[PDB]
Symmetry: T
Subunit: 141 residues, 12 copies
């Protein structure tokens, strides 16, 4: 029923660099697209964004306590934060890691994720439709 | 309209190991699920499997010449074949790389792909629904 | 006389995963155990926890200015934060690094600490008694 | 005209360790020196410091939206934060990375920067005059 | 009740280098301190030292057969001996690894231990009080 | 008073590749700019260039014997010559290492310098103004 | 009762290089020796060779479905094929990996095997008697 | 007299990607150019291409038995196949390895060849004339 | 005729850990099995075990002087001792290295042997039958 | 029309070591062979050799200014000199790198070249005919 | 006056392998040569050999307590023993490390020494005269 | 009879840094000491120094042609020059590599030598007596 979509650092800046990297959809448009899709699927999507690791951790803690699934795009913290990994390892419902860009076609440091080994699955490089596809996985799960 | 789904070595063996690793769906069931989904999406899915790298290359060559999109699960060749990478780099339509298992939760050698850097995107660890989600991306693309 | 016990990200979640990883004592129980032990030793323990690196840094800054000893369990930041290391290098009184779990029996990335080289000493894998043993070292120091 | 000087974790502690590492100038003195130099150059310097990555990111976001140049000394986050790198990659005006100490004469982990590849340039080991020299580059740019 | 304290190569030389590295307590004084503490705790400590790996192995074998806990400071063999690791993996009662010096502040080769992954826990850099603190852990265990 | 500016291999070729890499100023123009700036600062700049390591070493030897400061852009020898490093380690007055290009944005092999650890400081990626900024540091030093 | 002996690329060329590397027995002689030994042991040996990975995979698939033991000398694919590893991981009866030459005395790349971690055991450097010794292990198993 | 030219995976696709990578000559044109050159040199060139490793191995086996020289462009198998290396090590006449593209200017994984250490020589980056130049070496050999 | 079987550290402890790792046969049973097999083969087996490297070296020295073959299971010293390697390099008769467990399925540090490159051959993971199979190789040699 | 052949350190010593490494042709003979071939091709070859990096750089500078092609065998500087690489990157006409010996069959340090990534192409292991084959490429270019 | 010459594992076997590796002088001859040279120099040489690390450590301990210089050829323990390094770090008089063979021309693992960083100096590859040359250094020291 | 002593970059600067690194003997004093010792040994020592690699190479070439032994202290080129290695590999008489300082106690980059693998032997850390000891080896050779 309830799905948490959690976006990390810099994801509030969607639609401000060249559409080359992350597409032309803004974060507000993203929230709207996700909500619309979620309703069609008979889910409720709670979509939140923060540039603060501590805030992200608190959202993951609540999802852990509620046994709610998480779609998480951690931004740069994907590649650097053990703390985020430790919080996500508490989750009992599925965790789908999403990257808008194809990280495997960028710098080598983006090709490692602390989150992938503990996630249910990972979607990269399908732009913002990656979130919609994750919702749909969760609706069937 | 037409989408090629190409499965590589050992994928014909789906449903024969413990459902732990790859799920309980057989390859024939997979073909059927994909075809059914593709028709609902108004696509035609051509689904093929081989344990022979040369056969896989020939299928990729035809997709390149037809400018058709490919959903490719290369099995073990993901981690080892430059030749497959070179064939896939000719593709002008999208290439979505799919892994049934979450390779990031397994041996370290499964965490490298020669295909990811040239793919449009990658879906891992969502089981066979990963193919269905790729079809759906392509139907919107 | 005064000892600061500083816990970092996710340590507020003690007692919520399987007792396998970190034991069944909660953070509030931990505070209570530490305070009781500290009083028996004729010390005052100030025990604080935050998931925010900036808050942790500020607590370390105050300990540096007061020349007070610190028992620090930085959680995931142990393995990732140079900033925390830089703050701890100002400390003139002892710094004892504590890990509840035996990090050497877990993932390889947990086997590196930015803090160990600048700490007085390190206690790992003795569960929450690791804090009590650190207090006792400080009472004799 | 307007230049942002952004200092990251622990830079508020300038003048509190042995003058060996970072010199004897405090952060307030630094702000004053920079402002005085900036006025002589006919610039306005906005100088800000935070130990919070999220706050640093927000300052970089504003500089990106205003197309203003940034002189950035990220402290320990230089060596660890992809998120900071991603925010700085939006900047369209110059980015000069500054380190007070000669990081190349210290620990090996200080010899890598996530920021250098996307900066216009880098000044290290010239103490606080490194900021003044960056201002002067920007006044001619 | 019975605890074995086993010291490896060069530990008989305690109190002969500058107090900088290992302190000014000799091995005989160490035995005496440990015995006194053990009696206060209502334990019996059997404290033994050898520069011979084979002798150390035989002591570990006996502790394994008696199901007795071991506090082990293996000296240089910590970083080099698989054989010692294999003997210690038989132990069914706790194994606490102790280093007098903070190995993390010395040469990089001292930062790896073959023993840590199989030990219950590890205490480093607290000087000879590290042994006393291990005894106290065992008295509560 | 006297400052030596020493340029190494290929720096005589300034202004001959695309202005992309090193700018459009020639070496003769560079000498002129440096001299003009030095006079304004009340310094005398002795500016020399050679493609011969032995000649560079001899210039560094003379600066060492005269206790004169050196601004050194060693070209490709930055990344390869221990001999140059050994000569520069004799210098008792400051050594400022200068790179015209941002080496951190180029090939990985340009990101290591044998000179940085023994230099007073390093300026990269500020083009030829990097020399002028070094002069100004020295005038205040 | 039934044992499959599977030889991979280039093993059909036995007896054609200097007897230094692989001995002077041809593949046909090898088949004959194995059959003779197998009969003495009261086993039936099915001995097959191919330079085609796909053919090797199909033979391993059949052994998996029949629950038959495999003695496998994969030739160069030992060091390179994940696909072969994946097929061999299905085997429920024993898998003995055999190398005629002592791979540990040759190039470093021959010292890694994708098969060893999933094999029951490995025999190297005992020439063709390695096959006979594997048969004998299986006859007792 | 007789020279074998053997092309591996994807070389049948010459002239189908942008002329940037491999030139605009097709494989059929290549065969024709080689034959014409060979006749001028008084040689007979047997030119063959396959995407199948097993087929390539069989061609190398025949060249080994006939003591005929080989010009080999193995495509992606250059970087991945030990089996191909093992077959080529049987060759008693010269082996010239040819790459159309300059592999040293591409991805790092293309800069390693299993074939180079056992080849007589290697020609890279001279396009299809690399084959013609190899023929000419063999005509003088 | 005479074969030396030499077992190193911890091999006297066979049959004392879970049969999972090394089987349920004790060292005395092993000696008996080997002797019985050796007599059937018309050999004399001299079987010795020590936890002392110096004792092992002396046994290898005697085998070198007598030109007698050695079956050696060095235990943990396999992975760590150059001295043992140097002694074994004197042997003129065959040296067969034996491991009871499949070291390739355990920790990565067990996957390197200082002995394999100088051994005639290596048998791993066939339990105690590995010794019997080595005897049989030697009886035919 | 004009082609520069530039030989680096030790190439003046051709014909003085065992013909095993570099052949029996001296440098003077090499000059003569190249000149004769060049005339047959209707080219003029200017062939020069120096053990001085600075002299080599000056020759490359002149070829850059004249837009003349270079055949360069840099000797040991191939593997060590960034300065040479930087000079060769100015060349607008083709650069063919030549090695007489097959560097891939020698020490590992000879398998890296700073020149290959910026060269048009590379010929190794064809002895002195490698120069003649490069001339012929240039005559067709 | 008194100099200790300490030889480690396998050095008692001098003169038993091909004179290629270590020369044809036996250990007894070596003792005699050293004694004769020492007397000519007006020194007393105490020459001892053991294959037991513990015995070597005890000899080093005595040299440390007597403040006597040591010439040490540790054999294979050079490359493997931290314990030996720790004992040698107590020595206050000079420590000269000697290797008979040129370890730099052998396996790569022989090119690392735990002893070199703490030795006064090192002599390798001068055969047994290396000991005589060390004595002579000590006689002048 | 004749021995060449060849000193490389910066060795003309002996006696100008703190006696800590290289001692207080100047190069002229060194020449004098060597000559005096050589005469006592009935040798003639030709002692030469240059900061120019090309000059060093030419001296090594002459020693190769005269079949004269070389004592070589290459300075920083020890760690960086393949060209020097290639010249020294021609030498048929002994080559003794000498370092005044103990390079193993300094930076890690000084612990690799391109010369050691081809030298007869190596003396490090015995100061200038290292040259005298090399002469004496050569007088007995
Ligand atoms: O592609 C993504 O969605 C991504 O997770 C996002 C960011 C930051 C986006 O501004 C980057 O830090 C990640 O490396 C990739
Ligand atoms: O998870 C998958 O789908 C996968 O692509 C498939 C195989 C082989 C499946 O038998 C494995 O070789 C890959 O590592 C992962
Ligand atoms: O064992 C610990 O106490 C530890 O410091 C704590 C955490 C996070 C605890 O939730 C982990 O991030 C550390 O790796 C180990
Ligand atoms: O030298 C600097 O200015 C520096 O950026 C600052 C800090 C933290 C300063 O307390 C360190 O974390 C950096 O490694 C170096
Ligand atoms: O600090 C310790 O107690 C230590 O275990 C002891 C020794 C040898 C002590 O002489 C060293 O070999 C270890 O690296 C650290
Ligand atoms: O950017 C510079 O100034 C630099 O020092 C110069 C050269 C050579 C310039 O032709 C290059 O070799 C360095 O890598 C960068
Ligand atoms: O020694 C063997 O049997 C071996 O498996 C065989 C081959 C190919 C044999 O031609 C090689 O590819 C392997 O590295 C070793
Ligand atoms: O440049 C070549 O000729 C090359 O051998 C060919 C291929 C495949 C060509 O489609 C690539 O796989 C090689 O890396 C380079
Ligand atoms: O499997 C074996 O026989 C083995 O040689 C034995 C030991 C020690 C056995 O107690 C281990 O040290 C080796 O790694 C593996
Ligand atoms: O093979 C060659 O031509 C080569 O370029 C030449 C030399 C020096 C030749 O004396 C070596 O330094 C190179 O590694 C290989
Ligand atoms: O060359 C030597 O003297 C040496 O120290 C001796 C031995 C053992 C000699 O049998 C080897 O273990 C060392 O690697 C080299
Ligand atoms: O110790 C030596 O003699 C040495 O060869 C000399 C130099 C340069 C001396 O100024 C250094 O470059 C070497 O690393 C060490
Ligand atoms: Na919620
Ligand atoms: Na991970
Ligand atoms: Na999209
Ligand atoms: Na199709
Ligand atoms: Na890749
Ligand atoms: Na699924
Ligand atoms: Na406090
Ligand atoms: Na560290
Ligand atoms: Na506890
Ligand atoms: Na502003
Ligand atoms: Na980077
Ligand atoms: Na300053
Ligand atoms: Na006991
Ligand atoms: Na370990
Ligand atoms: Na203490
Ligand atoms: Na001057
Ligand atoms: Na350095
Ligand atoms: Na500029
Ligand atoms: Na069968
Ligand atoms: Na593996
Ligand atoms: Na055999
Ligand atoms: Na043919
Ligand atoms: Na290779
Ligand atoms: Na061409
Ligand atoms: Na015997
Ligand atoms: Na080895
Ligand atoms: Na068994
Ligand atoms: Na010319
Ligand atoms: Na390169
Ligand atoms: Na030739
Ligand atoms: Na003595
Ligand atoms: Na060391
Ligand atoms: Na000798
Ligand atoms: Na001479
Ligand atoms: Na080398
Ligand atoms: Na001296």
């Amino acid at each position: 029923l309830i799905v948490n979509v959690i976006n990390g650092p810099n994801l509030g800046r969607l639609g401000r660099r060249e559409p080359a990297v992350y597409g032309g959809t803004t974060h507000d448009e993203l929230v709207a697209l996700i909500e619309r899709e979620a309703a069609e699927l008979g889910l409720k999507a709670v979509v939140r964004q923060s540039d603060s690791e501590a805030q992200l951790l608190d959202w993951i803690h609540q999802a852990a306590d509620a046994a709610e699934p998480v779609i998480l795009n951690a931004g740069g913290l994907t590649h650097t934060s053990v703390a985020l990994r430790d919080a996500c390892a508490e989750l009992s419902a599925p965790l789908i890691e999403v990257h808008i860009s194809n990280v495997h076609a960028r710098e080598e440091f983006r090709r490692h994720s602390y989150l992938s080994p503990i996630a249910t699955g990972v979607i990269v490089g399908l732009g913002i439709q990656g979130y919609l596809l994750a919702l749909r996985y969760l609706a069937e799960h």
